[PDB]
Amino acid sequence: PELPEVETTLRGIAPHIEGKTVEAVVLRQLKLRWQINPDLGEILSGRQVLSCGRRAKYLLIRFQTGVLLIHLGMSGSLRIFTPSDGRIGRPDRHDHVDIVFSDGTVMRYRDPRKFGAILWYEGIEEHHPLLEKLGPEPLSEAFCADYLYARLKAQKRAVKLALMDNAVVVGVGNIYANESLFRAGISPHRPANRLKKKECALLVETVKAVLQRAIETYTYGRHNQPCPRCGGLVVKETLGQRGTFYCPNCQK
Ligand SMILES: [Zn+2]
């Protein structure tokens, strides 16, 4: 799951649980990628979920005594059973966590590869070990032109290495990085320092647009095919330990 997948998971889960009271927590597994607190039932039972949100690939269920972090990893997913619909199908070898509310809603966590994580954190999200070294979120006004200009003035690896760095900004993997760097016309190999504000603005805007469309659920893998704007031979290179596609006639 990439960032937009987790965002649509959040938007599909938030209404059905926000404001509800946890009646019980059935644990069918205690070891994922990290150990699950073996006594989540008493911890969550009776305490209303105050809000729900996301940061990078981590879903956050904020209560009044802490926060529950859920990482779906490589194969993880969540599903909501409303009591007014159907029947709750019997669990699986891969349905590890149930959260039963007093409304009847049930939240089931499924991870056939046992790679996700369910962590309970009493403290400040700003200082979580898995969360502190993260940059600002795209889709947020903390991702401005001035932030990027101040963040690229120090290091100047190629633009793709900095864009795919979770410390610079979260959630832009290979696909979105390539697509956003073409649509901006800034080139993957440009020195990060040698851009300027007038292109950092348009690049953060194009990143936001690429991601925003990526969540409403293509210009990459197009080497040796003419470019939609220039028309150029767009090339494919392996630098950055990941595939790269760009138009050498546009992007500088
Ligand atoms: Zn072109």
PDB file of C-alpha atoms in Angstrom, residues 9-231:
ATOM      1  CA  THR A   9      -8.549   3.475   3.739  1.00  0.00           C
ATOM      2  CA  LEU A  10      -8.679   6.355   6.221  1.00  0.00           C
ATOM      3  CA  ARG A  11     -11.591   8.014   4.419  1.00  0.00           C
ATOM      4  CA  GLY A  12     -13.454   4.695   4.281  1.00  0.00           C
ATOM      5  CA  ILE A  13     -12.922   3.944   7.974  1.00  0.00           C
ATOM      6  CA  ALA A  14     -13.243   7.373   9.640  1.00  0.00           C
ATOM      7  CA  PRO A  15     -17.060   7.810   9.408  1.00  0.00           C
ATOM      8  CA  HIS A  16     -17.933   4.293  10.564  1.00  0.00           C
ATOM      9  CA  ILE A  17     -15.942   4.464  13.819  1.00  0.00           C
ATOM     10  CA  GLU A  18     -15.444   8.141  14.764  1.00  0.00           C
ATOM     11  CA  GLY A  19     -17.361   8.854  17.963  1.00  0.00           C
ATOM     12  CA  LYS A  20     -18.004   5.181  18.772  1.00  0.00           C
ATOM     13  CA  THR A  21     -17.090   3.365  21.987  1.00  0.00           C
ATOM     14  CA  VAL A  22     -14.906   0.250  21.944  1.00  0.00           C
ATOM     15  CA  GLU A  23     -16.786  -2.667  23.508  1.00  0.00           C
ATOM     16  CA  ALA A  24     -14.056  -5.307  23.097  1.00  0.00           C
ATOM     17  CA  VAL A  25     -10.862  -6.136  21.202  1.00  0.00           C
ATOM     18  CA  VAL A  26     -10.401  -9.733  20.019  1.00  0.00           C
ATOM     19  CA  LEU A  27      -6.754 -10.598  19.366  1.00  0.00           C
ATOM     20  CA  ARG A  28      -6.101 -13.685  17.241  1.00  0.00           C
ATOM     21  CA  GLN A  29      -2.416 -12.801  16.773  1.00  0.00           C
ATOM     22  CA  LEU A  30       0.171 -10.965  18.853  1.00  0.00           C
ATOM     23  CA  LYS A  31       3.235 -10.940  16.559  1.00  0.00           C
ATOM     24  CA  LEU A  32       3.214  -9.102  13.229  1.00  0.00           C
ATOM     25  CA  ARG A  33       6.263  -7.103  12.225  1.00  0.00           C
ATOM     26  CA  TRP A  34       6.237  -5.881  15.835  1.00  0.00           C
ATOM     27  CA  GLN A  35       4.584  -7.410  18.871  1.00  0.00           C
ATOM     28  CA  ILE A  36       1.017  -6.324  19.602  1.00  0.00           C
ATOM     29  CA  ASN A  37       0.305  -5.143  23.129  1.00  0.00           C
ATOM     30  CA  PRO A  38      -1.263  -8.328  24.535  1.00  0.00           C
ATOM     31  CA  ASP A  39      -3.734  -6.424  26.644  1.00  0.00           C
ATOM     32  CA  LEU A  40      -5.398  -4.043  24.159  1.00  0.00           C
ATOM     33  CA  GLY A  41      -8.894  -5.136  25.231  1.00  0.00           C
ATOM     34  CA  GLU A  42      -8.784  -3.551  28.682  1.00  0.00           C
ATOM     35  CA  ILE A  43      -6.878  -0.564  27.270  1.00  0.00           C
ATOM     36  CA  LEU A  44      -9.489   0.308  24.631  1.00  0.00           C
ATOM     37  CA  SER A  45     -12.732  -1.068  26.116  1.00  0.00           C
ATOM     38  CA  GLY A  46     -15.141   1.708  27.072  1.00  0.00           C
ATOM     39  CA  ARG A  47     -13.010   4.599  25.776  1.00  0.00           C
ATOM     40  CA  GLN A  48     -14.543   6.469  22.842  1.00  0.00           C
ATOM     41  CA  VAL A  49     -12.440   7.016  19.732  1.00  0.00           C
ATOM     42  CA  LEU A  50     -11.979  10.779  19.614  1.00  0.00           C
ATOM     43  CA  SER A  51     -10.648  11.198  16.076  1.00  0.00           C
ATOM     44  CA  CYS A  52      -8.894   9.456  13.192  1.00  0.00           C
ATOM     45  CA  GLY A  53      -6.152  10.603  10.851  1.00  0.00           C
ATOM     46  CA  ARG A  54      -3.049   9.640   8.931  1.00  0.00           C
ATOM     47  CA  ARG A  55       0.647  10.435   8.622  1.00  0.00           C
ATOM     48  CA  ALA A  56       2.683   8.845   5.796  1.00  0.00           C
ATOM     49  CA  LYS A  57       1.763   5.113   5.679  1.00  0.00           C
ATOM     50  CA  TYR A  58       0.485   5.023   9.287  1.00  0.00           C
ATOM     51  CA  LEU A  59      -3.180   5.171  10.268  1.00  0.00           C
ATOM     52  CA  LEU A  60      -3.787   6.907  13.608  1.00  0.00           C
ATOM     53  CA  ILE A  61      -6.823   6.301  15.826  1.00  0.00           C
ATOM     54  CA  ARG A  62      -6.632   9.006  18.507  1.00  0.00           C
ATOM     55  CA  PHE A  63      -8.346   8.293  21.849  1.00  0.00           C
ATOM     56  CA  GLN A  64      -8.325  10.287  25.099  1.00  0.00           C
ATOM     57  CA  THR A  65      -5.498   8.233  26.659  1.00  0.00           C
ATOM     58  CA  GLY A  66      -3.293   7.586  23.622  1.00  0.00           C
ATOM     59  CA  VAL A  67      -3.181   6.732  19.935  1.00  0.00           C
ATOM     60  CA  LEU A  68      -3.390   3.449  18.022  1.00  0.00           C
ATOM     61  CA  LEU A  69      -1.004   3.242  15.063  1.00  0.00           C
ATOM     62  CA  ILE A  70      -1.863   0.754  12.315  1.00  0.00           C
ATOM     63  CA  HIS A  71       0.556  -0.078   9.492  1.00  0.00           C
ATOM     64  CA  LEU A  72      -0.854  -2.286   6.748  1.00  0.00           C
ATOM     65  CA  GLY A  73       2.624  -2.932   5.362  1.00  0.00           C
ATOM     66  CA  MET A  74       2.732  -4.950   2.147  1.00  0.00           C
ATOM     67  CA  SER A  75      -0.522  -6.941   2.308  1.00  0.00           C
ATOM     68  CA  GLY A  76      -2.605  -5.406   5.100  1.00  0.00           C
ATOM     69  CA  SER A  77      -6.168  -4.159   4.962  1.00  0.00           C
ATOM     70  CA  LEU A  78      -9.073  -3.228   7.213  1.00  0.00           C
ATOM     71  CA  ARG A  79     -12.782  -3.877   6.803  1.00  0.00           C
ATOM     72  CA  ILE A  80     -15.911  -2.568   8.514  1.00  0.00           C
ATOM     73  CA  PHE A  81     -18.923  -4.738   9.370  1.00  0.00           C
ATOM     74  CA  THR A  82     -22.015  -2.653  10.117  1.00  0.00           C
ATOM     75  CA  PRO A  83     -24.681  -4.573  12.081  1.00  0.00           C
ATOM     76  CA  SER A  84     -27.341  -3.280   9.682  1.00  0.00           C
ATOM     77  CA  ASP A  85     -25.632  -5.151   6.806  1.00  0.00           C
ATOM     78  CA  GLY A  86     -25.412  -8.875   6.191  1.00  0.00           C
ATOM     79  CA  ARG A  87     -23.609 -11.353   8.429  1.00  0.00           C
ATOM     80  CA  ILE A  88     -20.119 -11.197   9.940  1.00  0.00           C
ATOM     81  CA  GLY A  89     -18.306 -13.979   8.110  1.00  0.00           C
ATOM     82  CA  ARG A  90     -16.322 -16.300  10.346  1.00  0.00           C
ATOM     83  CA  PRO A  91     -12.672 -15.212  10.750  1.00  0.00           C
ATOM     84  CA  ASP A  92      -9.604 -16.489   8.919  1.00  0.00           C
ATOM     85  CA  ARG A  93      -6.044 -17.638   9.429  1.00  0.00           C
ATOM     86  CA  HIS A  94      -5.269 -14.085   8.240  1.00  0.00           C
ATOM     87  CA  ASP A  95      -7.885 -12.076  10.202  1.00  0.00           C
ATOM     88  CA  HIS A  96      -5.735 -11.248  13.212  1.00  0.00           C
ATOM     89  CA  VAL A  97      -7.467  -8.349  15.022  1.00  0.00           C
ATOM     90  CA  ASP A  98     -11.141  -7.607  15.663  1.00  0.00           C
ATOM     91  CA  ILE A  99     -12.392  -4.394  17.269  1.00  0.00           C
ATOM     92  CA  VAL A 100     -15.998  -4.736  18.450  1.00  0.00           C
ATOM     93  CA  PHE A 101     -17.909  -1.566  19.292  1.00  0.00           C
ATOM     94  CA  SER A 102     -21.087  -1.308  21.336  1.00  0.00           C
ATOM     95  CA  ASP A 103     -22.818   0.069  18.228  1.00  0.00           C
ATOM     96  CA  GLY A 104     -22.299  -3.349  16.616  1.00  0.00           C
ATOM     97  CA  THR A 105     -19.708  -2.086  14.146  1.00  0.00           C
ATOM     98  CA  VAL A 106     -16.711  -4.416  13.903  1.00  0.00           C
ATOM     99  CA  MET A 107     -13.301  -3.461  12.492  1.00  0.00           C
ATOM    100  CA  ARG A 108     -11.349  -6.446  11.159  1.00  0.00           C
ATOM    101  CA  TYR A 109      -7.643  -6.317  10.299  1.00  0.00           C
ATOM    102  CA  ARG A 110      -6.425  -8.783   7.668  1.00  0.00           C
ATOM    103  CA  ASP A 111      -2.765  -9.375   6.794  1.00  0.00           C
ATOM    104  CA  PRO A 112      -2.074 -12.696   5.037  1.00  0.00           C
ATOM    105  CA  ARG A 113       1.684 -11.981   5.117  1.00  0.00           C
ATOM    106  CA  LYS A 114       1.836 -10.855   8.784  1.00  0.00           C
ATOM    107  CA  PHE A 115       3.798  -7.711   7.916  1.00  0.00           C
ATOM    108  CA  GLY A 116       1.730  -4.849   9.353  1.00  0.00           C
ATOM    109  CA  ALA A 117       1.835  -3.492  12.894  1.00  0.00           C
ATOM    110  CA  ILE A 118      -0.636  -2.537  15.627  1.00  0.00           C
ATOM    111  CA  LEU A 119       1.029  -0.279  18.196  1.00  0.00           C
ATOM    112  CA  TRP A 120      -0.454   1.552  21.180  1.00  0.00           C
ATOM    113  CA  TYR A 121       1.288   4.823  22.033  1.00  0.00           C
ATOM    114  CA  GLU A 122       0.674   6.921  25.145  1.00  0.00           C
ATOM    115  CA  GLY A 123       2.483  10.130  24.275  1.00  0.00           C
ATOM    116  CA  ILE A 124       3.059  12.730  21.582  1.00  0.00           C
ATOM    117  CA  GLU A 125       2.742  11.736  17.926  1.00  0.00           C
ATOM    118  CA  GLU A 126       5.376  14.357  17.070  1.00  0.00           C
ATOM    119  CA  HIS A 127       8.025  12.238  18.835  1.00  0.00           C
ATOM    120  CA  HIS A 128       7.026   8.708  17.828  1.00  0.00           C
ATOM    121  CA  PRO A 129      10.122   6.709  16.771  1.00  0.00           C
ATOM    122  CA  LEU A 130       8.483   5.740  13.462  1.00  0.00           C
ATOM    123  CA  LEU A 131       7.124   9.267  12.878  1.00  0.00           C
ATOM    124  CA  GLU A 132       9.601  11.967  13.968  1.00  0.00           C
ATOM    125  CA  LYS A 133      12.064  11.774  11.058  1.00  0.00           C
ATOM    126  CA  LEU A 134       9.266  12.445   8.553  1.00  0.00           C
ATOM    127  CA  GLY A 135       8.800  15.543   6.440  1.00  0.00           C
ATOM    128  CA  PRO A 136       5.589  17.480   5.896  1.00  0.00           C
ATOM    129  CA  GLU A 137       2.679  15.708   4.348  1.00  0.00           C
ATOM    130  CA  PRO A 138       1.671  16.400   0.757  1.00  0.00           C
ATOM    131  CA  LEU A 139      -1.989  17.529   0.693  1.00  0.00           C
ATOM    132  CA  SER A 140      -0.953  19.961   3.464  1.00  0.00           C
ATOM    133  CA  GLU A 141      -0.028  23.634   3.431  1.00  0.00           C
ATOM    134  CA  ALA A 142       3.186  22.742   5.270  1.00  0.00           C
ATOM    135  CA  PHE A 143       4.451  21.716   1.802  1.00  0.00           C
ATOM    136  CA  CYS A 144       5.188  25.146   0.323  1.00  0.00           C
ATOM    137  CA  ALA A 145       7.757  26.467  -2.125  1.00  0.00           C
ATOM    138  CA  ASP A 146       9.834  28.057   0.632  1.00  0.00           C
ATOM    139  CA  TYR A 147      10.026  24.787   2.566  1.00  0.00           C
ATOM    140  CA  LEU A 148      11.374  22.964  -0.493  1.00  0.00           C
ATOM    141  CA  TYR A 149      13.804  25.771  -1.344  1.00  0.00           C
ATOM    142  CA  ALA A 150      15.158  25.765   2.214  1.00  0.00           C
ATOM    143  CA  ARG A 151      15.253  21.945   2.221  1.00  0.00           C
ATOM    144  CA  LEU A 152      17.236  21.643  -1.021  1.00  0.00           C
ATOM    145  CA  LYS A 153      19.782  24.392  -0.276  1.00  0.00           C
ATOM    146  CA  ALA A 154      21.813  21.970   1.879  1.00  0.00           C
ATOM    147  CA  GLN A 155      22.076  18.694  -0.053  1.00  0.00           C
ATOM    148  CA  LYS A 156      22.115  18.445  -3.845  1.00  0.00           C
ATOM    149  CA  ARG A 157      21.779  14.838  -4.838  1.00  0.00           C
ATOM    150  CA  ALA A 158      19.636  14.365  -7.931  1.00  0.00           C
ATOM    151  CA  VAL A 159      16.069  15.599  -7.506  1.00  0.00           C
ATOM    152  CA  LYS A 160      14.668  12.065  -7.480  1.00  0.00           C
ATOM    153  CA  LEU A 161      16.762  10.997  -4.475  1.00  0.00           C
ATOM    154  CA  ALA A 162      15.474  13.965  -2.471  1.00  0.00           C
ATOM    155  CA  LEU A 163      11.875  13.599  -3.623  1.00  0.00           C
ATOM    156  CA  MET A 164      11.763   9.913  -2.645  1.00  0.00           C
ATOM    157  CA  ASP A 165      13.289  10.740   0.763  1.00  0.00           C
ATOM    158  CA  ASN A 166      10.616  10.397   3.455  1.00  0.00           C
ATOM    159  CA  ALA A 167      12.492  12.969   5.558  1.00  0.00           C
ATOM    160  CA  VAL A 168      12.068  15.601   2.831  1.00  0.00           C
ATOM    161  CA  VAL A 169       8.385  14.806   2.204  1.00  0.00           C
ATOM    162  CA  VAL A 170       6.343  11.665   2.746  1.00  0.00           C
ATOM    163  CA  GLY A 171       4.544   9.354   0.349  1.00  0.00           C
ATOM    164  CA  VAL A 172       5.974  10.004  -3.118  1.00  0.00           C
ATOM    165  CA  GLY A 173       7.303   6.649  -4.324  1.00  0.00           C
ATOM    166  CA  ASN A 174       8.816   5.901  -7.733  1.00  0.00           C
ATOM    167  CA  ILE A 175       5.666   6.329  -9.839  1.00  0.00           C
ATOM    168  CA  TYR A 176       4.551   9.670  -8.413  1.00  0.00           C
ATOM    169  CA  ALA A 177       8.111  11.017  -8.358  1.00  0.00           C
ATOM    170  CA  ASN A 178       8.620  10.267 -12.058  1.00  0.00           C
ATOM    171  CA  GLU A 179       5.208  11.602 -13.084  1.00  0.00           C
ATOM    172  CA  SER A 180       5.525  14.790 -11.013  1.00  0.00           C
ATOM    173  CA  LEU A 181       9.072  15.501 -12.179  1.00  0.00           C
ATOM    174  CA  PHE A 182       8.018  15.255 -15.818  1.00  0.00           C
ATOM    175  CA  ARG A 183       4.864  17.352 -15.390  1.00  0.00           C
ATOM    176  CA  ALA A 184       6.992  20.020 -13.708  1.00  0.00           C
ATOM    177  CA  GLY A 185       9.784  19.873 -16.281  1.00  0.00           C
ATOM    178  CA  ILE A 186      12.591  20.000 -13.703  1.00  0.00           C
ATOM    179  CA  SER A 187      14.520  16.775 -14.667  1.00  0.00           C
ATOM    180  CA  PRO A 188      15.522  13.914 -12.343  1.00  0.00           C
ATOM    181  CA  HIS A 189      19.288  14.596 -12.504  1.00  0.00           C
ATOM    182  CA  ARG A 190      19.206  18.339 -11.771  1.00  0.00           C
ATOM    183  CA  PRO A 191      21.213  19.314  -8.670  1.00  0.00           C
ATOM    184  CA  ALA A 192      18.695  19.797  -5.871  1.00  0.00           C
ATOM    185  CA  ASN A 193      20.377  23.028  -4.740  1.00  0.00           C
ATOM    186  CA  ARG A 194      20.385  24.600  -8.214  1.00  0.00           C
ATOM    187  CA  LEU A 195      16.622  24.843  -8.543  1.00  0.00           C
ATOM    188  CA  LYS A 196      14.965  28.010  -7.269  1.00  0.00           C
ATOM    189  CA  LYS A 197      11.669  29.100  -5.742  1.00  0.00           C
ATOM    190  CA  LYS A 198       9.928  29.631  -9.093  1.00  0.00           C
ATOM    191  CA  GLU A 199      10.342  25.928  -9.909  1.00  0.00           C
ATOM    192  CA  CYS A 200       9.995  24.546  -6.375  1.00  0.00           C
ATOM    193  CA  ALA A 201       6.523  26.109  -6.237  1.00  0.00           C
ATOM    194  CA  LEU A 202       5.410  24.497  -9.489  1.00  0.00           C
ATOM    195  CA  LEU A 203       6.984  21.180  -8.468  1.00  0.00           C
ATOM    196  CA  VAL A 204       5.200  21.009  -5.111  1.00  0.00           C
ATOM    197  CA  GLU A 205       1.985  21.979  -6.915  1.00  0.00           C
ATOM    198  CA  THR A 206       2.433  19.233  -9.514  1.00  0.00           C
ATOM    199  CA  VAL A 207       3.279  16.711  -6.770  1.00  0.00           C
ATOM    200  CA  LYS A 208       0.082  17.657  -4.949  1.00  0.00           C
ATOM    201  CA  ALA A 209      -1.900  17.296  -8.187  1.00  0.00           C
ATOM    202  CA  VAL A 210      -0.403  13.913  -9.107  1.00  0.00           C
ATOM    203  CA  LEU A 211      -1.100  12.622  -5.584  1.00  0.00           C
ATOM    204  CA  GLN A 212      -4.627  14.094  -5.406  1.00  0.00           C
ATOM    205  CA  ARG A 213      -5.542  12.349  -8.655  1.00  0.00           C
ATOM    206  CA  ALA A 214      -3.809   9.201  -7.373  1.00  0.00           C
ATOM    207  CA  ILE A 215      -6.409   9.146  -4.567  1.00  0.00           C
ATOM    208  CA  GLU A 216      -9.441   9.534  -6.888  1.00  0.00           C
ATOM    209  CA  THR A 217      -9.669   5.774  -7.393  1.00  0.00           C
ATOM    210  CA  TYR A 218       0.419   7.430 -17.219  1.00  0.00           C
ATOM    211  CA  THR A 219       2.445   9.985 -19.185  1.00  0.00           C
ATOM    212  CA  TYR A 220       6.470   6.180 -16.492  1.00  0.00           C
ATOM    213  CA  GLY A 221       7.205   2.993 -18.418  1.00  0.00           C
ATOM    214  CA  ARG A 222       6.959   5.098 -21.584  1.00  0.00           C
ATOM    215  CA  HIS A 223      10.612   4.886 -22.665  1.00  0.00           C
ATOM    216  CA  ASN A 224      11.044   4.833 -26.454  1.00  0.00           C
ATOM    217  CA  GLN A 225       7.599   6.421 -26.864  1.00  0.00           C
ATOM    218  CA  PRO A 226       7.172  10.072 -27.897  1.00  0.00           C
ATOM    219  CA  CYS A 227       6.517  12.590 -25.125  1.00  0.00           C
ATOM    220  CA  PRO A 228       3.050  14.192 -24.860  1.00  0.00           C
ATOM    221  CA  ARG A 229       4.394  17.781 -24.838  1.00  0.00           C
ATOM    222  CA  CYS A 230       7.766  17.977 -26.599  1.00  0.00           C
ATOM    223  CA  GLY A 231       7.307  14.656 -28.348  1.00  0.00           C
TER     224      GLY A 231
END
